Design a protein around this ligand. Structure first.
Ligand SMILES: *[C@@H]1O[C@H](CO)[C@@H](O[C@@H]2O[C@H](CO)[C@@H](O[C@@H]3O[C@H](CO)[C@@H](O)[C@H](O[C@H]4O[C@H](CO)[C@@H](O)[C@H](O)[C@@H]4O[C@H]4O[C@H](CO)[C@@H](O)[C@H](O)[C@@H]4O)[C@@H]3O)[C@H](O)[C@H]2NC(C)=O)[C@H](O)[C@H]1NC(C)=O
Ligand SMILES: *[C@@H]1O[C@H](CO)[C@@H](O[C@@H]2O[C@H](CO)[C@@H](O[C@@H]3O[C@H](CO)[C@@H](O)[C@H](O[C@H]4O[C@H](CO)[C@@H](O)[C@H](O)[C@@H]4O[C@H]4O[C@H](CO)[C@@H](O)[C@H](O)[C@@H]4O)[C@@H]3O)[C@H](O)[C@H]2NC(C)=O)[C@H](O)[C@H]1NC(C)=O
Ligand SMILES: *[C@@H]1O[C@H](CO[C@@H]2O[C@@H](C)[C@@H](O)[C@@H](O)[C@@H]2O)[C@@H](O)[C@H](O)[C@H]1NC(C)=O
Ligand SMILES: *[C@@H]1O[C@H](CO[C@@H]2O[C@@H](C)[C@@H](O)[C@@H](O)[C@@H]2O)[C@@H](O)[C@H](O)[C@H]1NC(C)=O
Ligand SMILES: CN(C)c1ccc2nc3ccc(N(C)C)cc3[s+]c2c1
Ligand SMILES: CN(C)c1ccc2nc3ccc(N(C)C)cc3[s+]c2c1
Ligand SMILES: *[C@@H]1O[C@H](CO)[C@@H](O)[C@H](O)[C@H]1NC(C)=O
Ligand SMILES: *[C@@H]1O[C@H](CO)[C@@H](O)[C@H](O)[C@H]1NC(C)=O
Lengths: 532, 532
């Protein structure tokens, strides 16, 4: 039977699922680790103990414990990112979508979800890998990993809560794929990791981390890169926050053993209820428990690794969206609302700048303000609104990724860069939010192919282009098909720095994605803050 | 006889001069002070001792001792600014152009020449006041004043070389006008001072200085304002340079008396030969001996006076040219030449920035560079060239004048602002130099009316518009004639900040002349350098 597969861990039984009036195999909720429960909370994951008999892999697994957004109850734009399954600490599972008939040795793609390291699920509608598996004839894997304190509490020097264990979850899932995907028709030699937001940052972190480098061939990073300021913290910072969490729960702080014991006795929701209280600044686009720069997962600082060329050298494909900042301004910045144009006053602009750049001294704030203010028309609410959007997106996503790109490309074996700037015809969010952080994903997973979802024909076409790029790149290291009459997506070179717009218009090629602003964020401002 | 005039100092005999095939009276080389010679070098000027008999005022007076530009021997563009008469320490004279027949009580305009406080002459072709006197029916006066060490050596606390004596020359000439111009048909109640470059800065300095305020009604400032960074120095800086001059001439430095005695024994040319050696920085658009902020001529710092409203409250008319920087880059900055396009490399750009902003620390240089570099195309020589031009003009002229304007306008009785951006059809300088510092003057003095000088008809018309503006403003406080079908040159208000282009195209009105760049120069950069 096509739905029965013997892996080194035991037999698994999947399910036949429909897709675009055809069918493929699906194996949902396969365990790649022991459940990290009780005295294993905060610890590194252990490999799943093999099982006899058949694992029922016909339903999605539980989602990991996490914050649940209830800002807009019942609003699809908001709810589409929340857990659709029940939450559990027992959550280290992966899902596999296999074509039918089963292939022998084909290209593998492994999805790492986003959610700012505090949230995320392998099981969301928007990450249903059947469309991609079916259309591009690839084995699509989506892994899971612990988020929040559960995955990233970091008391360095201790083995009970070392930090980064969420990233170790990810790696173990990749180990399992390396070891077992051949039984699903996957080719372990040709595995591509891809992710968005924290998943994109995670992808870049597996490129950097020596322990992870050998378990994949290529990488795709979507609106995330390992050097993003929200994506990691020093071990001293991990320590401060870990203790501050403990302090918020009236824990005994006299030692690491006593603090961890206290944090382990708690019900998960008691940790989630105060998670956000530990941030050291009044900020946006910052999350409480993120990867620590521990000297283990990362031999040295991210920046020195990028300079030295200390990272996996292969092909990468990556890019960003037109309006990466808007989501975070809506939630955290005064002046912004879901149901208004959100024209921003003088006062709310200054507030939003402080919030966007929490380490910036008075002078740093003047510098940002000077960069993003139209002085001809400096009290226009639309320009103020759009300026903050750009500030947040440039600082947190675009300019960090552009630094990564310029650094990686000096040593890598091929880079392809995109700017996704199509606003979906069916987008539930207001127009001022633009091309939103996260909303390229639905195109990458083929949702525009499903006709009851209400996308345009031009949008179906765009999704097909994108899926084919992604797949063809996973397979060959180049998103272009050798013959196509369609114009070539050019390589990104240090010298010419070419990228493409991804939208419904015929492909236009550009150069130097946001150089001026990114010179400010990457070179000038840091140096400004260092001199003060 | 129309050419004989009794003044409180004695009778003077002028000359009938031709002008646009008509004639008017001219009184050239009238003394307003004692010759500041011998033991009076560096001292405040004394009033001219009255004389019996007739003063022959039929020829131009000597020019004051000064540096002579010989960068381009015989080049009219260069030579037009050098002394056309013999140089002498005996140089405190003024010239008067009177209409014919003599008026009874008409509007007076008093020209204060530029030259960076190190040079200048009342007697240059380009400042021939006959065209203006004749066309607008005004009494036109041009004064003179000591430049260089001779006029601005500043050993504060001593009375032999107090500093600012050049400005006292200017004031005494204005005293003389106040006292005696009625005899020439001038109205002392309606005297307008106007000047360019250091003359414009001088005009603004007489607005600020209590001792000068009562001697004029209105003011025009052309490409100069009192707060320009090149226009003044602290008393400690005046002292350092004075001593450094002395040191360059092997003078005894044991005291002020001994140093001054040494400097007084020298032939003037020995002081001029080393004048430039005393600048404390490798710089451009900086001059050795300029007005000191002495607490006497200026009761307090320029900035606090502007804030408090401590200045004469009246009408002002002022503005700047499109390309104020080019002249100085040609002379001082590597890469720039008279006979090339002067496309500027990476290296020469960085050099020019250092030269343009001599007090700027490393970070200050990055900040300027970030502001003026097109990062899309950052190795284009034309953009590099044009960027430096803008840097120099914005920093030294436009942005200082815009600060003055915004500050003055809060307390003043009417401001009118212009941007002169017409390049003369007959300009001898190369095209890359643009609309050059100083080249609006010929329009203000009516040279486009003289047909053998080779200006266009459109240029004659522009000169007539400008002369009429200048005169009509001198007369009424408003450059607009009440009835004219021609569009009104609007008032500059704090709120709307309107100005006009001055060129051959039909008048267009604009707002906020270079806000963005001037926010950088006036607010951000200073604050940056203060925090470091
Ligand atoms: C593709 O396009 C189509 C057509 O353009 C989209 O159709 C939209 O879908 C909505 C429903 O999703 C539909 O409008 C509904 O009509 C029903 C009957 O006429 C209404 O009963 C219903 O209202 C309920 O939901 C609202 C909350 O969202 C409430 O405001 C309202 O009070 C109703 O809520 C009730 O719910 C509880 C529990 O069931 C009940 O006990 C109470 O009575 C309570 O009041 C909807 O208005 C329209 O046809 C379309 N509307 C819009 C705005 O587009 C289709 O959805 C698209 N496909 C996709 C996938 O998006
Ligand atoms: C208005 O427009 C008109 C017409 O368009 C302008 O006319 C220009 O004027 C110049 C002269 O100014 C004239 O060209 C001259 O022609 C003479 C005879 O043909 C030449 O002898 C003369 O050359 C001398 O000057 C040059 C230096 O500038 C030298 O390169 C050259 O070697 C000559 O120099 C000599 O000088 C010494 C001393 O006298 C002598 O002993 C030596 O022999 C020595 O060699 C000129 O070329 C042209 O008609 C026009 N040229 C240009 C470039 O425009 C008119 O000038 C305009 N009016 C105004 C006010 O600008
Ligand atoms: C495999 O499981 C299918 C659905 O499983 C459902 O969820 C799991 C967690 C259990 O609670 C189960 O009882 C639920 O039905 C079944 O429909 C299917 O019959 C199962 N097949 C086999 C061979 O075990
Ligand atoms: C007035 O002066 C005219 C020109 O003066 C000339 O320059 C002065 C400095 C003397 O050097 C003089 O000798 C020169 O001629 C004379 O042409 C004119 O005749 C003089 N007129 C009177 C009435 O004195
Ligand atoms: C409860 N608190 C303090 C916070 C603070 C910041 C936040 N930022 C977000 C950013 C994006 C997002 N998406 C669903 C895209 C959801 C959230 S939820 C959220 C909740
Ligand atoms: C001899 N040295 C050291 C210098 C230094 C700087 C200078 N700057 C100028 C600027 C403008 C100008 N004009 C005639 C407009 C002439 C000069 S001359 C000059 C001479
Ligand atoms: C990638 O590597 C191969 C050989 O290792 C080389 O020949 C090829 O040109 C490289 N391509 C790029 C874009 O670096
Ligand atoms: C100038 O002052 C007069 C009275 O002193 C006043 O009425 C007039 O409106 C003022 N104009 C401006 C532009 O300030």
């Amino acid at each position: 039977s096509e739905l029965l597969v013997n892996t080194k861990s035991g037999k698994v039984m999947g399910t036949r699922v429909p897709v675009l009036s055809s069918h493929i195999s699906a194996f949902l909720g396969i365990p790649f680790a022991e459940p990290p429960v009780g005295n294993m909370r905060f610890r590194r994951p252990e490999p799943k103990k093999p099982w006899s008999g058949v694992w029922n892999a016909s339903t999605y697994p539980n989602n990991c414990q996490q914050y649940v957004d209830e800002q807009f109850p019942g609003f699809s734009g908001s709810e589409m990112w929340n857990p659709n399954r029940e939450m559990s600490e027992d959550c280290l599972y992966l899902n596999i979508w296999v074509p039918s008939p089963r292939p022998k040795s084909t290209t593998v793609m492994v999805w790492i979800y986003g959610g700012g390291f505090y949230s995320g699920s392998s099981t969301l509608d928007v990450y249903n890998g059947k469309y991609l598996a079916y259309t591009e004839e690839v084995v699509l894997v989506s892994l899971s990993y612990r988020v929040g304190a559960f995955g990233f509490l970091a008391l360095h020097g201790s083995q009970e809560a070392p930090g980064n264990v969420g990233l170790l979850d990810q790696r173990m899932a990749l180990q399992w794929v390396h070891d077992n995907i051949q039984f699903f028709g996957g080719d372990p030699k040709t595995v591509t990791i891809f992710g968005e937001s924290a998943g994109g940052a995670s992808v870049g972190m597996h490129i950097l981390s020596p322990g992870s480098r050998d378990l994949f061939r290529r990488a795709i990073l979507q609106s995330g890169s390992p050097n993003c300021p929200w994506a990691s913290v020093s071990v001293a910072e991990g320590r401060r926050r870990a203790v501050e969490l403990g302090r918020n729960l009236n824990c005994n702080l006299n030692s690491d053993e006593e603090l961890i014991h206290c944090l382990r006795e708690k019900k998960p929701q008691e940790l989630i209820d105060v998670e956000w209280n530990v941030l050291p600044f009044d900020s946006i686009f910052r999350f409480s428990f993120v990867p620590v720069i521990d000297g283990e997962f990362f031999p040295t600082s991210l920046e020195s690794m990028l300079n030295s060329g200390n990272f996996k050298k292969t092909q990468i494909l990556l890019g960003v969206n037109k309006d990466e900042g808007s989501f975070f301004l809506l939630y955290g910045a005064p002046g912004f609302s879901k149901d208004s144009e959100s024209k921003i006053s003088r006062e709310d602009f200054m507030s939003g700048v402080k919030l966007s750049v929490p380490h910036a001294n008075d002078l740093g704030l003047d510098a940002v303000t000077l960069q993003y203010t139209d002085w001809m028309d400096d009290n226009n609410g639309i320009k103020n609104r759009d300026g903050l959007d750009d500030i947040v997106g440039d600082h947190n996503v675009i300019c960090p990724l552009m630094h990564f790109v310029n650094k990686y490309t000096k040593f890598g074996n091929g880079t392809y860069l995109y700017f996704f700037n199509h606003r979906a015809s069916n987008l539930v969010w207001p127009e001022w939010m633009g091309v939103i952080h996260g909303y390229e994903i639905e195109f990458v997973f083929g949702l525009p192919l499903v006709k009851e979802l209400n996308y345009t024909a031009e949008e179906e076409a765009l999704s097909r282009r994108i899926m084919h790029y992604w797949a063809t790149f996973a397979k060959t290291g180049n998103p272009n098909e050798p013959h196509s009459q369609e114009s070539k997506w050019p390589l990104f070179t240090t010298k010419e720095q070419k990228f493409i717009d991804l939208n419904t218009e015929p492909m236009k090629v550009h150069q130097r994605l946001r150089v001026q602003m990114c010179v400010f964020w990457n070179q000038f401002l840091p140096k400004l803050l260092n001199a003060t």
